[PDB]
Ligand binder design. Structure first.
Ligand SMILES: CO[C@@H]1[C@@H](C)O[C@@H](OC[C@@]23C[C@@H]4[C@H](C)CC[C@H]4[C@@]4(C=O)C[C@@H]2C=C(C(C)C)[C@@]34C(=O)O)[C@@H](O)[C@@]12OC(=O)[C@H](CCCCCCCC(=O)O)O2
Ligand SMILES: Nc1nc2c(ncn2[C@@H]2O[C@H](COP(=O)(O)OP(=O)(O)O)[C@@H](O)[C@H]2O)c(=O)[nH]1
Length: 822
């Protein structure tokens, strides 16, 4: 327990500060180990509550051991900050940002299950941020009490684990740090049981056995591990697992360390009453009061704790081997700064200089009971933040040349994040971890607070600023529609990042930056902007009705007089052309000379068609045509207006299910009209044309076309695999994967069926730890090979569902009901 003054004092000596976190796979013991640490070293102040993000630990070392510290030191006291980052192990972004404020890690590894997958994934992440590790093989009790392991066996398991780790380390750690591998002999690997409350390091033993009988420790600890043996008989040290007579010799580690431990377990767990007292007498393990009447487990726990207090071993490695802000910021400053390595600020970070311009990294915002408020949490890398001081909050985006929506505000208060409690402080010098009240609105998630103008931003998580999620929105009571329409306009004004629009299928669509963004946009819309009961739903997809080939036989249809008859056929127009029609290159409003040249010379159509085309449909200019290939027909030109209108009709709503036609060309092969106008007017022709087209259409191997998005995702070469996994489950098709010379992030491009997209952006982030950054756009129509008229096929399923939704007959009228024989 300390006072704000006491605390502030600890903060001045940043050489004696340790910023770290416990890295561990699930269930390996991280929670219990940290509590172990908190119970002995945890710090308190001597009602606002917050979500614990970090804890302060206090540890004082001996004048001697303090000399074992190969790094600038000042005093015997140390302030250790145990940062906490346990959510979604996969989400590398979320994690990395958090690990970024630490300089060291206590890597935990189970004795039995050793180094595994989740383990090396976090260890590799750490190395990524240039963090130095130390290991603790935990749950050693498990190996004994359960597996009945033998001394040489256990040693082997440890050696194995230690070796595995180092592979990960050397194979990935930067050379700019020097061999950062872990060595049991050098005291950077601990062994113990977090649960039972005991652990040890080679150093602890070597040091003890180093004064009991004056002998140097450095030398001694090198022997207490590896292939060094001590022949009891010869009274000498050997490097041979066999003596002169070739006879077996016991390893130093097993002889002087493991053995004492193994004996204590046997003598206790076997209730050997007589040996216990003496065994304890030789190890100098003194028990008090009632403790002398414990048995088995209950006694073993008490003894081991008194013998090898787990805290001491862990605290030792942290103080003697994990770097101080000073030591680390020197070789970590590069990566932490987006700007030039010679910049003023980048150099301050290098120097953990408190007198410089502020370089404060906001790691994340944290929820408090201070009424919806969030205190900013992070590290002061350069300069010193002060309560009141004005600061330049620099968002994820910001750049020194653009007002870029910066934010120059005043730190309402600087505070210590003591677990669930905060304590007001005046200022805080570089190298410390700290919390800030008053930046709730100006920033969300990562950020940077500088006091300089040339000051660039520090390496923070990047954002998603493209519309990647959307839903259709409808009012529940028809009469509120105008309120929804007005609300949608309001929503947009108040939010530069929201997008609203009308779907081809007449729906109000609202798209957001990510799921959460969308969620609030909807809440805001329903209860504020429009204030009306809404109905959110997956938007309805539009399809196109087309033909795969020409009518298998002339389509014939007689008017309701039986007087007039149309013989036509249909065939598929080419995509290139439909596209030209659609993009306005082949336009109905252009002079004929222009249109004629284009279709004949650039799109290779017969030079005589352009003059026979009667119209484009639907709406006069759609990618569908009526070419008059008749001949001796007398009054052929008297019905033109009717045929055109009938065409504008059939193309707006095809026969498969009322969707627009696309790429359809109808050839009016022949017509046998009447002689008098009385029996050929509108009412008689339209019905014949319309009907005959449907007949032609249906007879031309009809098909449906589905809309398809073009999606572009930028993501880390590692997570790039998730992109593929999701896309495979959604009929997606990869178009290209292009590398970036410096591996800052590959960019994958692929086609994703629109009807295969609801929830995609969400699934993408899940399969990539939010590492992938998508953006998508409508790109093209694509014919489905399946048969639209067979309810079982993908297409038939679609049509079925559609007709159903529409309240149409579920069955699709075959061509015959449109065809007219004899
Ligand atoms: C500039 O905004 C664009 C916006 C105006 O139009 C969008 O495409 C809309 C389209 C546009 C085309 C053409 C007009 C012809 C056929 C229609 C469609 C019919 O089904 C096919 C498309 C999807 C529709 C609906 C299902 C919503 C469409 C429609 O009916 O309008 C995209 O082109 C747009 O670009 C963006 O960047 C954000 C992307 C939103 C992506 C949502 C992805 C969903 C993933 C998830 O929810 O997980 O939106
Ligand atoms: N036998 C044994 N069990 C342990 C030890 N440390 C933790 N456990 C148990 O392992 C499980 C997971 O531990 P916990 O610390 O919550 O794991 P974490 O998910 O890594 O934080 C719990 O049931 C613990 O009680 C240990 O040293 N020995």
């Amino acid at each position: 327990a300390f006072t704000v003054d006491q605390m502030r004092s600890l903060m001045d000596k940043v050489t004696n500060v340790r910023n770290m976190s416990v890295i561990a796979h699930v269930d390996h013991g991280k929670s219990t180990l940290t509590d172990s640490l908190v119970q002995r070293a945890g710090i308190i102040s001597a009602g606002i509550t917050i979500k614990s993000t970090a804890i302060s630990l206090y540890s004082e070392m001996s004048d001697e051991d303090v000399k074992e510290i190969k790094q600038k030191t000042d005093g015997n006291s140390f302030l250790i900050n145990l940062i906490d980052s346990p959510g979604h192990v996969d989400f590398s972004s979320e994690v990395t940002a958090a690990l970024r404020v630490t300089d060291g890690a206590l890597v935990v590894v189970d004795t039995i299950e050793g180094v595994c997958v989740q383990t090396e994934t976090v260890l590799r992440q750490a190395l990524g941020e240039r963090i130095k590790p130390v290991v603790v093989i935990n749950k050693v009790d498990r190996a004994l009490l359960e597996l009945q392991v033998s001394k040489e066996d256990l040693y082997q398991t440890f050696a194995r684990t230690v070796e595995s780790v180092n592979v990960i380390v050397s194979t990935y750690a930067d050379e700019v740090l020097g061999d950062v591998q872990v060595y049991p002999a050098r005291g950077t690997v601990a062994f113990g049981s977090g649960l039972h409350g005991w652990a040890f390091t080679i150093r602890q033993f070597a040091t003890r056995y180093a004064k009991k009988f004056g002998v140097d420790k450095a030398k001694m600890m090198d022997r207490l591990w590896g292939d060094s043996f001590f022949n009891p008989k010869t009274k000498k040290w050997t490097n041979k697992d066999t003596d002169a007579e070739g006879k077996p010799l016991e390893r130093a580690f097993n002889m002087f360390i493991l053995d004492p431990i193994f004996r204590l377990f046997t003598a206790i767990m076997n209730f050997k009453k007589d040996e216990i007292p003496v065994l304890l007498e030789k190890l100098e393990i003194v028990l008090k009061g009632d403790e002398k009447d414990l048995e088995g487990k209950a006694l073993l726990k008490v003894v081991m704790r008194k013998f090898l207090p787990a805290a001491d071993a862990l605290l030792e490695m942290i103080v003697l081997h994990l770097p101080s802000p000073v030591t680390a910021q020197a070789y970590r400053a590069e990566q932490l700064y987006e700007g030039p390595a010679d910049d003023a600020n980048c150099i301050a970070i290098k120097n953990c200089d408190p007198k410089a311009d502020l370089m404060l990294y906001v790691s994340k915002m944290v929820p408090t009971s201070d009424k919806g408020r969030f205190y900013a949490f992070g590290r002061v890398f350069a300069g010193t933040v002060k309560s009141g001081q004005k600061v330049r909050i620099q968002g994820p985006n910001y750049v020194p040349g653009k007002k870029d929506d910066l934010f120059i505000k005043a730190i309402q208060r600087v505070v210590l994040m003591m677990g669930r409690f905060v304590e007001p402080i005046d200022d805080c010098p570089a190298g410390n971890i700290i919390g800030l009240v008053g930046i709730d609105q100006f920033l969300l998630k990562t950020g940077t607070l500088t006091t300089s103008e040339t000051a660039h931003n520090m390496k923070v998580m990047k954002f998603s600023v493209s519309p990647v999620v959307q839903v259709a929105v409808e009012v529940k009571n028809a009469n509120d529609l105008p309120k929804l329409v007005e609300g949608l306009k309001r929503l947009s004004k108040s939010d530069p990042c929201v997008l609203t629009y009308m779907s081809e299928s007449g729906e109000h669509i609202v798209a957001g930056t990510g799921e959460l963004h969308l969620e609030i946009c909807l809440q805001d819309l329903e209860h504020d902007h429009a204030g009306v009961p809404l109905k959110i739903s997956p938007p309805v997809v539009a399809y196109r009705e087309t033909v795969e080939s020409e009518s298998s036989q002339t389509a014939l249809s007689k008017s309701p007089n039986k007087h007039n008859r149309i013989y036509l056929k249909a065939e598929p127009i080419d995509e290139e052309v439909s596209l030209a029609i659609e993009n306005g290159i082949i336009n109905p409003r252009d002079d004929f000379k222009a249109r004629a040249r284009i279709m004949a010379d650039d799109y290779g159509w017969d030079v005589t068609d352009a003059r026979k085309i009667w119209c484009f449909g639907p709406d006069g200019n759609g990618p569908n045509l009526v070419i008059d290939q008749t001949k001796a027909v007398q009054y052929l030109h008297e019905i033109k207006d009717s045929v055109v209108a009938a065409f504008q009709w059939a193309t707006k709503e095809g026969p498969i299910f009322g969707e627009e036609m696309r790429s359809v060309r109808v050839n009016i092969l022949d017509v046998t009209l009447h002689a008098d106008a009385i029996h050929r007017g509108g009412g008689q022709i339209i019905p014949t044309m319309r009907r005959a087209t449907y007949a032609g259409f249906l007879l031309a191997d009809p098909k449906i076309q589905e809309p398809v998005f073009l999606v572009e995702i930028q993501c880390p070469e590692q997570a790039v695999g998730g992109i593929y996994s999701v896309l495979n489950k959604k009929r997606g098709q990869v178009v290209s994967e292009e590398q970036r010379p410096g591996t800052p992030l590959f960019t994958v491009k692929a086609y994703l069926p629109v009807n295969e997209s609801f929830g995609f952006t969400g699934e993408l982030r899940q399969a990539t730890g939010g590492q992938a950054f998508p953006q998508m756009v409508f790109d093209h129509w694509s014919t489905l090979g399946s048969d639209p008229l067979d309810p079982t096929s993908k297409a038939g399923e679609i049509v079925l569902a559609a007709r159903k939704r529409h309240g149409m007959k579920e069955e699709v009228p075959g061509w015959q009901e449109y065809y007219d024989k004899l």
